[PDB]
Amino acid sequence: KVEEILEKALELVIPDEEEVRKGREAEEELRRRLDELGVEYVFVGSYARNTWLKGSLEIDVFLLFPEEFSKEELRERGLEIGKAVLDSYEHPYVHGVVKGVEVDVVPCYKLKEPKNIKSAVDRTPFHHKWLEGRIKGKENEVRLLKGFLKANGIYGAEYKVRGFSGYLCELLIVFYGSFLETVKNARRWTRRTVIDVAKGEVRKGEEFFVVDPVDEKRNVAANLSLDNLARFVHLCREFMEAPSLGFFKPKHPLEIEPERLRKIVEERGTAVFAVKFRKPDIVDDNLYPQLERASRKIFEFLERENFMPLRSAFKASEEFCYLLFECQIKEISRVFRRMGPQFEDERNVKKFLSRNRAFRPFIENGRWWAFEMRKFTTPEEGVRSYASTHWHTLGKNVGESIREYFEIISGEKLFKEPVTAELCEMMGVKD
Ligand SMILES: Nc1ncnc2c1ncn2[C@@H]1O[C@H](COP(=O)(O)OP(=O)(O)OP(=O)(O)O)[C@@H](O)[C@H]1O
Ligand SMILES: [Ca+2]
Ligand SMILES: [Ca+2]
Ligand SMILES: [Ca+2]
Numbered sequence: 001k002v003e004e005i006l007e008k009a010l011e012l013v014i015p016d017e018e019e020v021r022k023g024r025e026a027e028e029e030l031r032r033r034l035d036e037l038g039v040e041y042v043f044v045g046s047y048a049r050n051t052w053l054k055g056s057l058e059i060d061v062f063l064l065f066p067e068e069f070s071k072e073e074l075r076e077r078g079l080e081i082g083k084a085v086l087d088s089y090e091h092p093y094v095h096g097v098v099k100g101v102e103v104d105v106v107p108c109y110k111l112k113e114p115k116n117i118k119s120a121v122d123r124t125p126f127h128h129k130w131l132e133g134r135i136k137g138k139e140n141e142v143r144l145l146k147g148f149l150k151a152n153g154i155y156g157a158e159y160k161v162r163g164f165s166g167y168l169c170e171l172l173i174v175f176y177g178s179f180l181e182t183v184k185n186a187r188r189w190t191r192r193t194v195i196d197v198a199k200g201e202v203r204k205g206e207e208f209f210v211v212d213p214v215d216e217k218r219n220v221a222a223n224l225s226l227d228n229l230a231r232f233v234h235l236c237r238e239f240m241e242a243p244s245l246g247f248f249k250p251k252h253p254l255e256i257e258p259e260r261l262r263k264i265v266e267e268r269g270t271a272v273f274a275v276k277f278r279k280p281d282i283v284d285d286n287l288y289p290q291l292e293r294a295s296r297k298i299f300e301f302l303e304r305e306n307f308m309p310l311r312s313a314f315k316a317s318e319e320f321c322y323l324l325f326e327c328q329i330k331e332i333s334r335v336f337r338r339m340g341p342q343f344e345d346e347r348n349v350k351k352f353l354s355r356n357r358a359f360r361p362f363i364e365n366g367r368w369w370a371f372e373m374r375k376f377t378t379p380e381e382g383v384r385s386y387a388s389t390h391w392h393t394l395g396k397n398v399g400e401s402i403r404e405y406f407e408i409i410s411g412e413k414l415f416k417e418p419v420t421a422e423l424c425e426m427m428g429v430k431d
C-alpha cells in the first residue's frame with residue numbers, strides 16, 4: 001500500500017503547470033536584465049534544483065563580488081532588476097517580485113572555493129554546488145519529505161516553526177536515497193544522533209547534528225527543536241505502521257463553539273487565562289523567540305508562586321499577542337509560611353520577631369517560621385503583579401509592549417479572542 005500512497009502524495013507535493021509557468025517566465029526575464037548589467041550571478045534556489053514544494057515558488061539570485069562593501073552595488077542591481085523592491089534584513093538583501101514571482105537578490109563573494117567572510121550568505125553558493133549534482137532525479141523524493149513535514153507543521157527553520165529547513169530535507173534525501181528510506185531510518189533516530197553526510201555515516205554525539213558537507217562544524221539541523229525532531233520520528237513510526245495520504249494533508253482546525261470550550265475547561269477544573277498585549281513591530285524571527293521567553297518566565301513565576309502551571313502557549317495575530325496559560329490551582333490560601341532563622345541566631349531572631357503579624361510565628365525543626373499574607377491568591381492576580389513590575393524580563397520588545405499596556409483575560413471573553421486553535425491544542429482537545 002505504501003508505494004501507492006506516495007504516488008497519490010506526489011499530486012499534493014508537485015507544482016501545477018501554471019505556477020511552474022510563473023517560474024520559467026520570471027527566471028528567463030530575470031536573467032535578461034541581469035545579463036544586460038553584465039552581472040555575475042547564480043540561482044541558488046530550491047527553484048534552481050526543481051526541488052521546491054507545490055505552491056511555494058521563489059527564486060534566490062546570488063550576486064558574486066570580491067572587496068568589502070557590496071551593500072549598495074546590490075541595492076542597485078536588485079532595485080534595477082526587480083519590478084518591485086522591498087528590503088529585508090552583512091545582512092541587507094533585496095526582496096522583490098519579477099514577472100509575478102518572489103525574488104531574493106543577495107550579494108556574496110564569488111569565492112575561490114571555501115573560506116568565507118563573516119560566513120553566512122557566502123556558504124549558500126557551495127551548498128548549491130554540493131546539492132546540484134547529487135540531488136538530480138530525486139527532486140520529487142524531496143518534495144515528498146517537505147510535503148510530509150509541511151502537512152504536520154514542522155517544515156521550515158524559521159523560529160516560528162523550529163522545524164526542518166529545506167537544505168536539511170535535501171541533505172537527508174541525498175543521504176538515504178528517498179523519502180521512504182528516510183522515514184524508515186528516522187524511526188530509529190535519537191536526540192544524540194549525528195548524521196554526517198560527507199562521510200556517509202551515522203554516529204552518536206551530544207545532540208541531533210546533521211553535519212554540513214561544506215562545513216563540518218555547522219549543524220544544518222540547528223533550528224530543529226528537540227520536540228519537533230521527536231515529533232518527526234513519531235510521525236515516521238506512525239506512517240510505516242499504517243501509511244495514509246492523510247499524512248500529506250493539513251489537519252483541520254477544531255471547530256469549537258465557545259460554550260464547548262467553557263465546558264471542557266470547567267470539566268478540567270483548571271484556571272485558563274491569557275495575557276493580551278500589542279504586538280510590537282518586529283520581524284517573526286525576533287518576535288517569536290521573545291514570545292517563547294516571555295511565556296517561559298511567566299510560567300516559571302507561576303510555578304514558584306505555586307499555582308502549578310500545566311502548560312503554556314502563545315499566539316501572534318496582526319495586532320495583538322497572547323500568552324496562554326492553564327494552572328491546576330484556581331485559588332490559593334491567603335496565608336503562607338515565611339521561613340525564619342535558626343533558633344540559635346539570637347539577632348536575626350529578634351529581628352524576625354519584631355515585625356508585626358496577624359498571627360504568632362513558631363518553631364519547627366529548630367527554625368523559626370511565620371504566617372504571612374500573600375499579595376494575591378489567584379494565578380490571574382499573580383500574573384498582573386508580575387507583568388506589571390517584571391516586564392523587563394519578558395524580552396526587550398514584548399516586555400516594552402506589555403509595559404505600555406496589557407490585560408489578563410479569562411472565561412468566555414478569552415474564548416472570543418482568536419486563540420481557540422492554540423487553546424485546544426494546549427489542552428489536548430480532540431474532534
Ligand atoms: N543555502 C541554501 N541552500 C538551498 N537553498 C537555499 C539556500 N539559501 C537560500 N535558499 C532558498 O531557500 C528557499 C527554501 O528552500 P531550500 O533552498 O532550502 O530548498 P528546498 O526546501 O528543497 O525547497 P522548497 O523550500 O521550495 O521546498 C528556496 O527558494 C531556496 O532557493
Ligand atoms: Ca508554530
Ligand atoms: Ca509547531
Ligand atoms: Ca481574590
Ligand SMILES: [Mg+2]
Nearest residue numbers: 058059060104
Ligand atoms: Mg529565499
